[PDB]
């Protein structure tokens, strides 16, 4: 048996490599980005946005974020999904973004995911898996985003219920807002300190 290759920080330039187009480097014809909605993608369009704060409350303007999620019916666009249901064929389920260098704001355009089966016949509430990389972060930090308008489902979510501090569970719930007809979920991430966001070892 082999040991996993050790993690190292992404460092301050984690976008030359992961988002070149926005470091103004035109090397690729097809570029990966933060838009998971294609024209025929099924489901309700939502915008996910927020900022990432260090231990003094300053937003990180060098952070790289990715999300991974199921389609509108709760099926993952992955060969490893074993539900035996057909996934939306016009949905990658993944995206990547950086924070705006000035403001620190990050965002994704995606669809609200459907509920996914949990272990042993349980059902998970709708969620998006999120990972954060940045200078100073030695290993990518994993967290999840749940939705405040799914309070009934959240109350029965296996993962949320496995957090014994009911006050920390709330750091994982994004707030629904409605900016000019568009549905927006605001999810701020506090890496360290008061109201520190829950991070998982998955």
């Amino acid at each position: 048996e082999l040991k996993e290759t050790p993690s190292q920080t992404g460092g301050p330039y984690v976008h030359i490599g992961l988002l070149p187009k926005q470091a103004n480097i035109e090397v690729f014809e097809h570029n990966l980005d933060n838009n998971l909605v294609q024209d025929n993608t099924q489901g309700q369009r939502i915008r996910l946005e927020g900022q990432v704060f260090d231990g003094l409350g300053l937003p990180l303007r060098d952070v790289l974020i990715e999300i991974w999620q199921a389609d509108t019916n709760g099926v993952y666009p992955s060969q490893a999904d074993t539900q035996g249901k057909q996934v939306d064929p016009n949905f990658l389920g993944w995206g990547r973004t950086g924070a705006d260098f000035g403001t620190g704001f990050w965002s994704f355009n995606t669809i609200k995911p459907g509920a996914v089966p949990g272990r042993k016949g349980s059902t998970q509430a709708p969620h998006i898996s999120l990972i954060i990389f940045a200078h100073g972060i030695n290993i990518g930090l994993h967290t999840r985003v749940y939705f405040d308008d799914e309070a009934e489902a959240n109350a029965k979510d296996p993962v949320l219920n496995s957090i014994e501090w009911a006050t920390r569970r709330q750091t994982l719930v994004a707030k629904r807002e409605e900016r000019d007809g568009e549905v927006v979920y605001r999810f701020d991430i506090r890496i360290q300190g008061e109201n520190e966001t829950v991070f998982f070892d998955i």
């Binding site: 030359i16 490599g17 090397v27 993952y76 666009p77 949990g118 296996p158 300190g193």
Partner: protein, 238 residues
């Protein structure tokens, strides 16, 4: 064969979040312990990227940004295999890399080091591993560079890499170094890794038989991701 969960990440084989010798980590590391969860379909699935979308020079950092001529620096090929912890090849995984040029300078807005920019070098590439977990790319060896941690800190030459493979739980970003670089012994970032054997797991080895005469040198570097266990009794994933 019915697959179960990925084996638990062995935290003693990785850097801790808080590592005071790497100053930036002091305010960017959680104070609370990570919450371990039992895996669900969310953690064992991951996206698929099609080969069709990749261009012909995506893995050739020597030519993919060359405009008027070739970039200046040491021509090197880097290759190796990506496998999981139980030794199985990781097929069609997305490998992305990025790095400084021969001067130790990044083509990034925020890099103001005096090492010279190279108009024919971009510094990023990507590839998918093949059915044997093999990958290969060509580049210019990066120069070491100064950064402010203590005032005279210098990173050894290194290439940053990222892997998206079969399960979200395998998601990994790290950096590899070049055999014999004397800065490897003094770097506070590499020293966040607790054990000497794991620090050596990030050093790419000179592969002399694979050098190409009058053309390029070659380094060998393998990567190991977490592996999934097989289930033979109850399958509790769902």
């Amino acid at each position: 064969i019915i697959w179960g969960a990925y084996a638990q990440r062995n935290t003693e084989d990785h850097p801790p979040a808080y590592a005071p010798g790497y100053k930036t980590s002091v305010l960017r590391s959680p104070k609370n312990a990570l919450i371990s969860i039992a895996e669900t379909l969310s953690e064992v699935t991951a996206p698929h990227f099609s080969a069709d979308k990749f261009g012909p020079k995506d893995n050739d950092l020597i030519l993919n940004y060359a405009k008027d001529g070739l970039p200046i620096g040491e021509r090197v090929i880097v290759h190796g295999y990506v496998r999981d912890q139980f030794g199985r090849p990781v097929k069609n995984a997305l490998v992305e890399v990025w790095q400084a040029n021969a001067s130790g300078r990044y083509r990034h807005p925020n890099d103001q080091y005096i090492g010279a920019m190279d108009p024919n070098f971009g510094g990023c590439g990507r590839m998918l591993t093949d059915d044997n977990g093999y990958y290969v790319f060509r580049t210019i060896k990066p120069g070491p560079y100064p950064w402010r941690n203590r005032i005279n800190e210098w990173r050894p030459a290194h290439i940053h890499f990222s892997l998206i493979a079969d399960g979200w739980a395998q998601r990994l970003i790290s950096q590899f170094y070049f055999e014999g670089d004397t800065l490897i012994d003094s770097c506070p970032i590499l020293k966040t890794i607790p054990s000497e054997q794991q620090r050596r797991a990030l050093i790419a080895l000179e592969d002399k038989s694979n050098f190409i005469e009058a053309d390029s040198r070659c380094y060998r570097f393998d990567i190991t991701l977490r592996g999934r266990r097989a289930t033979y009794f109850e399958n509790d994933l769902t």
